[PDB]
Design a binder for these strands. Structure first.
Lengths: 56, 203, 146, 161, 94
RNA sequence: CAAGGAGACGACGGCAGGAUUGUUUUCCGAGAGGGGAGGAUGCUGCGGUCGGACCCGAAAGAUGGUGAGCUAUGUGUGU
RNA sequence: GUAGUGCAGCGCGAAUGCGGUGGUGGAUGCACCGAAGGCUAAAUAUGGCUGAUGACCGAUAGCGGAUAAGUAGAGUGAUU
RNA sequence: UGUCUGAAUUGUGUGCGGUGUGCACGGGGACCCCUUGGACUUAAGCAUAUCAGUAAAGGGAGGAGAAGAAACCAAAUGGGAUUGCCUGAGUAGCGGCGAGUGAAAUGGCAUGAGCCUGUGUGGUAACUGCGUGGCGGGUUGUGUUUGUGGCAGCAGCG
């Protein structure tokens, strides 16, 4: 999630996922943030406050 | 005692003698500038009850403050939000004007430390206050254990953090059930504890 | 064992149990309890008809430690004697127990029949009229204590 | 939808925070080493102070006793002592409390005399080391309350036991 | 407490002891130095304008008009009665 | 064509199945007044609510900063 | 905080066997306390650094970054 | 040891002296204290309300900070400084009495500790910053001895 990505909207003949800003590098214009994009985040990230122990 | 007689006189502000001395000395202050030095105390016995001594390393300054409501600067009153937040003209400041005067005198002498302050007069446009300050680098101060506490590191710029008597007055501290919103030490640390959820490992 | 999980059997079936025509959307109907006087009025009528409106006097700061008055029934009053001293009383049928409910956490005495035909002494705050009849009917007597 | 109790779960603030200590077994035993290290830095003196017996306030807790904060200046004086000198002997003094009961005043005077007979005075840490004095981390003479017992009379139940 | 419980109520007998309590207020062995300092202050200083205008209402006889002028300008009622008691005794002495 | 890719997790309540133990219960009423009647603590699953809340998607709103090397107008000095 | 729970501007402005408080505005009993000067360990919070651990990931995963990575490159610039 | 720079200063403000000699400024800012202060969002619309005195911005500190020794809580046979956790309790209450919002005392634990001053002699300031038996301050009021000794501990190196 370390980008300022934004979607381009419709009207350009490509799908609606948000995309990296800039120029001059192959990262520019690729998908970001989504769980199905290369280098994205997990749909439901794992958290530290799940229950690890149980009571007998 | 000698201090009993001076106390009874200074309490009767506005009685035929104090009304003469107030007009004569406030005419002096109006000819000096925004913040200036005085050599002896104006009200000698009120200054000694607030902590002043006749010793090297004690200093007195007088400062004025401008007397009214606080300012909000939007071009023609546009505040860029909802109508409950669009008031311009009758908003009152959060601190007292006696604490605003300490911030003026504490920047002018950045090498000293503020101790207390008190009222000394008034105008149509200004009020005047008398600030007591101490030299944290003099050996006369660093050597005696009645004022020595102010020379350590948590004691720098007490009047910027709300630790003098005038600025303490606005924090909302006290005893009993009429002061529930400051338990823990201040308003913000009461907020934080009550906006936290604590869980045990075994739950 | 114990029914593993619904998601494990839904893999492969489109729509995951929520229907094709009506779907699984965001908040269709409003958040929390919205609509309570308009389109959810049938909900409150059928299940929670006493929820809205005011009803009563409103005491600021009720004081609960000073109003504690926990009751107990005359019908027990004998199983309240601790386990050690109980057999001492049932074997010698010529001694009378003196029981003070206040030392076990009770304040008021109400209730029914005394469970045995022997006298006793009972101290408390406030016996009710029916408790007074059933303690006197066996030959015991009641006392008001602190 | 459905017949359920109306829910009141408060998670509408993004500023909320969660807090969990994930290893309370190592945290307890790190605090017991701190507690045994103070005890042998105060070595001869036992790290806890003698406290009085008091009574819980309202009508709900009326019949229960408890350890309190400190003794009063009159309780210390009648036990043969000055409150400036009781504080050098490991006794806690509270000058806010007031004296209004004569039975409770007497239990607390005898609690002091019992404690004054179980302490030994020396002149140096060397002597106490050589006499077998050890460090103490517990509390001095804890209060425990007794069980409820049932009285017993015999057929004299008109003189109102 | 419920009203039925307050009727049959029984308290514990306590046996109160005997020991002196605190002082609570201006001490009785310093009136001489407090009375002297206040008698020097009224000779030195004059009178406030509010006390001038209130002894002229007591001057005629108007103990009521003076009573409402002092209650409006001192924000209390217990205080305005204690002040028209001092300003009446300073006339008898005067 | 290959690989990655979406009802998992927390809090509070209910019910079902299961484990251990069982000498369990502060009631009615706005009040004033009146007055005896098997659960508790864990474990797994499902339905409900608030949490980013099954995954991806607006036109907008606010706080704090950058630009007159393109272009527009005024003014100093040249061609 | 319900008829100030607390704070501030402007104006008025106290007392000395006296002053303050008791979840509804005011009165009066009884109860309980002494403001408007100063300092004070311990038990509590937490980026990063260093030690010790783990039913964690195994090169499209894991930090953006297992390599001369905030580098090569892009933008007048803030930035990316 | 550290070229030339950078707060970057041969400066600006200010204390003590009377021309000597000090101090402040910038960096960082997770956590802490003070100031200022939104809108998205929820109410299936929306204006009080909510999000929230939260984000962003600014000023000032430390290994923690802030708080703190009753002008308290209460209504018993009374408790007794501050700070943290469980219960009390999603309760008393606030609220287009709508959506929502929301304490505390008592009881049980952890840790426990209390002090300094503005009215100090008059048979003589009994006081101290600088200096080696003196100068400066001070009666509009100063009042400040002492640890290569002991006791307990913590880390590192070979």
């Amino acid at each position: 999630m370390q980008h300022s990505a934004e979607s381009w909207g419709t009207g350009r003949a490509i799908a609606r996922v948000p995309r990296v800003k800039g120029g001059g590098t192959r990262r520019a214009g690729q998908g970001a943030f989504a769980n199905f994009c290369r280098k994205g985040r997990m749909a439901h990230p794992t958290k530290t406050h799940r229950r690890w122990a149980r009571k007998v | 005692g000698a201090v009993n007689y001076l106390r009874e006189i200074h309490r009767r502000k506005q009685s035929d003698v104090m009304r003469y001395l107030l007009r004569i000395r406030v005419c002096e202050y109006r000819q000096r500038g925004e913040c200036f030095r005085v050599e002896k105390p104006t009200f000698l016995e009120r200054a000694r009850t607030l902590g002043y001594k006749a010793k090297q390393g004690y200093v007195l300054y007088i400062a004025r403050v401008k007397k009214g409501n606080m300012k909000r600067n939007y071009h023609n009153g546009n505040t860029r939000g909802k109508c409950v937040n669009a008031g311009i003209n009758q908003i009152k400041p959060s601190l007292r004007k006696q604490a605003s005067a300490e911030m003026i005198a504490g920047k002018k002498c950045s090498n000293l430390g503020v101790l207390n302050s008190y009222w000394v007069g008034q105008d149509a446009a200004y009020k005047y206050y008398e600030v007591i300050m101490v030299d944290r680098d003099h050996q006369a101060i660093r050597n005696d254990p009645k004022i020595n506490w102010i020379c350590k590191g948590t004691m720098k710029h007490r009047e910027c953090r709300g630790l003098t008597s005038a600025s303490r007055k606005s924090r909302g501290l006290g005893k009993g059930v009429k002061f529930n919103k400051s338990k823990g030490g201040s308003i913000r640390s009461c907020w934080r504890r009550r906006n936290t959820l604590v869980l045990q490992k075994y739950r | 064992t114990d029914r593993v999980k619904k998601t494990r059997k839904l893999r492969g079936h489109v729509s995951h149990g929520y229907g094709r025509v009506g779907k699984h959307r965001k908040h269709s109907g409003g958040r929390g309890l919205a609509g309570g006087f308009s389109h959810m009025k049938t909900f409150f009528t059928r299940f929670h008809p006493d929820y809205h409106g005011k009803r009563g006097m409103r005491v600021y700061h009720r004081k609960e430690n000073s109003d504690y008055a926990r009751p107990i029934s005359s019908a027990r009053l004998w199983g309240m004697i601790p386990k050690e001293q109980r057999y001492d009383f049932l074997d010698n049928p010529e001694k009378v127990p003196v029981i003070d409910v206040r030392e076990f956490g009770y304040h008021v005495v109400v209730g029914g029949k005394l469970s045995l035909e022997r006298p006793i002494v009972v101290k408390a705050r406030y016996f009710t009229p029916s408790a007074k009849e059933e303690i006197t009917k066996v030959g015991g007597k009641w006392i008001i204590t602190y | 939808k459905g017949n359920h109790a109306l829910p009141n779960n408060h998670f509408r603030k993004t500023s909320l925070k969660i807090r969990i200590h994930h290893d309370p077994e190592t945290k307890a035993r790190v605090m017991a080493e701190k507690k045994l290290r103070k005890a042998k830095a105060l070595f001869p003196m036992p790290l806890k102070k003698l406290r009085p017996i008091v009574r819980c306030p309202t009508i709900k807790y009326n019949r229960n006793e408890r350890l309190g904060r400190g003794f009063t200046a009159a309780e210390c004086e009648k036990a043969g002592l000055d409150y400036r000198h009781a504080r050098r002997l490991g006794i806690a003094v509270d000058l806010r409390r007031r004296d209004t009961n004569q039975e409770a005043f007497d239990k607390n005077v005898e609690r002091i005399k019992t404690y004054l007979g179980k302490i030994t005075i020396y002149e140096s840490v060397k002597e106490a080391r050589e006499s077998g004095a050890k460090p103490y981390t517990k509390e001095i003479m804890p209060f425990v309350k007794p069980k409820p017992v049932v009285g017993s009379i015999s057929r004299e139940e008109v003189a109102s036991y | 407490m419920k009203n039925a419980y307050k009727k049959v109520r029984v308290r514990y007998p306590v046996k109160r002891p005997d020991v002196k309590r605190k002082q609570r207020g201006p001490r009785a062995e310093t009136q001489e130095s407090r009375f002297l300092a206040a008698a020097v202050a009224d000779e030195i200083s004059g009178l406030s304008p509010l006390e001038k205008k209130a002894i002229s209402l007591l001057e005629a006889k108007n103990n009521n008009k003076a009573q409402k002028l002092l209650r409006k300008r001192l924000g209390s009622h217990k205080r305005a009665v204690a002040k028209v008691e001092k300003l009446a005794r300073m006339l008898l002495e005067k």
